[PDB]
């Protein structure tokens, strides 16, 4: 209960919520794209790696999106995935689509 209801609040309380783990390539990626769109005022990370309950964390992410990996990314509650999701979003205009929908970019 309590894990859920903290992974809840970070995704519900950020527009954009990333789910991370320490020293990650992909994670590093998907949050330089992101901060490319200058998100970072609507964005919050969490090394999940850093915290004793990292295996409760991944799987409810997992119930969540299917995947238990890190990087995971929400943006307005809604699931985007890893960073290979958010590259093809990014890509072939999905992404720019999600944050116009928000006011996030013009
Ligand atoms: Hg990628």
Redesign the pocket.
């Known amino acids: 209960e309590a894990v859920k209801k903290w992974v809840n609040k970070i995704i519900e309380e950020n527009i954009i919520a990333v789910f991370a783990k320490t020293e990650c390539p ?1 994670c590093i ?1 998907a949050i330089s794209i992101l901060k490319g769109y200058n998100l970072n005022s609507h964005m919050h990370v969490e090394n999940i790696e850093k915290n004793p309950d990292m295996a409760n964390i991944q799987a409810y992410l997992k119930e969540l999106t299917g995947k238990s990996s890190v990087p995971r990314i929400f943006i307005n509650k809604d699931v985007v995935g890893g ?2 999701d958010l ?1 093809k979003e990014n890509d072939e205009g999905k992404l720019k689509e999600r944050l116009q929908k928000l006011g996030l970019v013009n």
């Open positions: 992909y990626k960073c290979d590259v």
